């Protein structure tokens, strides 16, 4: 009983019709559930037994399917409806990989910034470097940290904002954590960004330490 979901990523605009499909390796009859999870929130049940809708679910959400193939449809996608969706095998309680639904938009290159460690923080004994991507679409981005010629990962923690309502863009904050002794040993610091809108890697740096 392996559960597959399609599409893995979907981009839609308000007023469009969105369709997610979940295929089961073998027939599960109508024992298929659909859930909605918004970023950083607990899941919500939409449909149960393939076609039956839960209370509090907008009627624009519709369920269909029998046997192996099932479908979830949002008739008039709204800003509220953009979230991550899953299919679960009701009897076996097996969840699907999930589908992320975000607003459709033209590719926008990120605006890169690199902020050096603050003199206030350096006195404490710890130094943290921040690389900022401000307004880009799609969300997918590759951030690399190189100190002097090369640095590897394991020191970096990343954070991405949720898509903006007005501009439909994402912003990313990558923070590199270093010790005072280790930071002052090296002079150059840099971060490299890669993204569909970026034809060539954008790398911004500062020289002190």
């Amino acid at each position: 009983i392996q559960m597959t979901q399609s599409p893995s990523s979907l981009s839609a605009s308000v007023g469009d019709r969105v369709i997610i499909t979940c295929r089961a390796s073998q027939s599960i009859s109508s024992s298929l559930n659909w859930y909605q999870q918004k970023p950083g929130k607990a899941p919500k049940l939409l449909i149960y037994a393939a076609v039956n809708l839960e209370t509090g679910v907008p009627s624009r959400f519709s369920g269909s399917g029998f046997g192996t193939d099932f479908t979830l449809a949002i008739s008039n996608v709204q800003p509220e409806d953009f979230a991550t969706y899953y299919c679960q095998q009701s009897d076996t309680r097996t969840f699907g990989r999930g589908t992320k639904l975000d607003v459709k938009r033209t590719v926008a290159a990120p605006s890169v910034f690199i902020f050096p460690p603050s003199d206030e923080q350096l006195k404490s004994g710890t130094a943290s470097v921040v690389c900022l991507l401000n307004n880009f679409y799609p969300r997918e981005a590759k951030v690399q940290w190189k100190v002097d010629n090369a640095l590897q990962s394991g020191n970096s923690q990343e954070s991405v904002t949720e898509q903006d309502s007005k501009d439909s863009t994402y912003s990313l904050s990558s923070t590199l954590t270093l010790s005072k002794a280790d930071y002052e040993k090296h002079k150059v610091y840099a971060c490299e960004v890669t993204h569909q809108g970026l034809s060539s890697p954008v790398t911004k740096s500062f020289n002190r330490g």
Binding site: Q121, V130, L132
Partner: protein, 208 residues
């Protein structure tokens, strides 16, 4: 030759399982007990359990909340504490008991595991993030628990502000950043302030 484990920070009303693993002797043939010493106080016996788990005894004050168990196959001892409270803050020792002269004496002891019951609260440390179109920000860095409120210019700055979601560091402390898009011309003439409020620590900060 007794090593202890399971110590850490517990919320008031929480639960924790302490463990004591034995080496160099037959754990299966020897009785065991648990003793605790609160900071700057005397030692207090907690529980005793037989080598076969046949006989088990507890302290009256720790009634209904503590349970002792052991698996001789793994040569391990266990203390399960529930409904934990501040009075239970102490270093817990596991010790081997020996029956000599129709009495029970503790001859082996463990180094100890520290259990402290309190709500963790750390105030945030705010650091500046300054660089035609420019970006500046604030870094809240280490704090606990999560909720932190960031505003710029006492709420004057609006859409340019993007406050990123908190990330948990290796320190066990949450850290977030707040950025804002501003005119490059304003860098020389205007000052931008970030108001970070962390109510658990009752802290209100203005920076830059």
């Amino acid at each position: 030759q007794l090593q202890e484990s399971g110590g850490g920070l517990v919320k008031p009303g929480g639960s924790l399982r302490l463990s004591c693993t034995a080496s160099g002797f037959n754990f299966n043939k020897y009785n065991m007990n648990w003793v605790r010493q609160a900071p700057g106080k005397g030692l207090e016996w907690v529980s005793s359990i037989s080598a076969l788990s046949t006989y088990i005894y507890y302290a009256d004050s720790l009634k209904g909340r503590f349970t002792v168990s052991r698996d001789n196959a793994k040569n391990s001892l266990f203390l399960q504490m529930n409904s934990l409270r501040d009075d239970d803050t102490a270093v817990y020792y596991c010790a081997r008991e020996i029956r000599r002269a129709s009495t029970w004496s503790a001859d082996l002891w463990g180094r100890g595991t520290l259990v402290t019951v309190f709500n963790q609260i750390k105030g945030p440390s705010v650091f500046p993030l300054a660089p035609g179109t420019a970006a500046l920000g604030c870094l809240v860095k280490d704090y606990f628990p999560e909720p932190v409120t960031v505003s710029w210019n006492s709420g004057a700055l609006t859409s340019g502000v993007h406050t990123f979601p908190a990330v948990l560091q290796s320190s066990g402390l949450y850290s977030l950043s707040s950025v804002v898009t501003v005119p490059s011309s304003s860098l020389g003439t205007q000052t931008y302030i970030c108001n970070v409020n962390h109510k658990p620590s009752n802290t209100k900060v203005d920076k830059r």
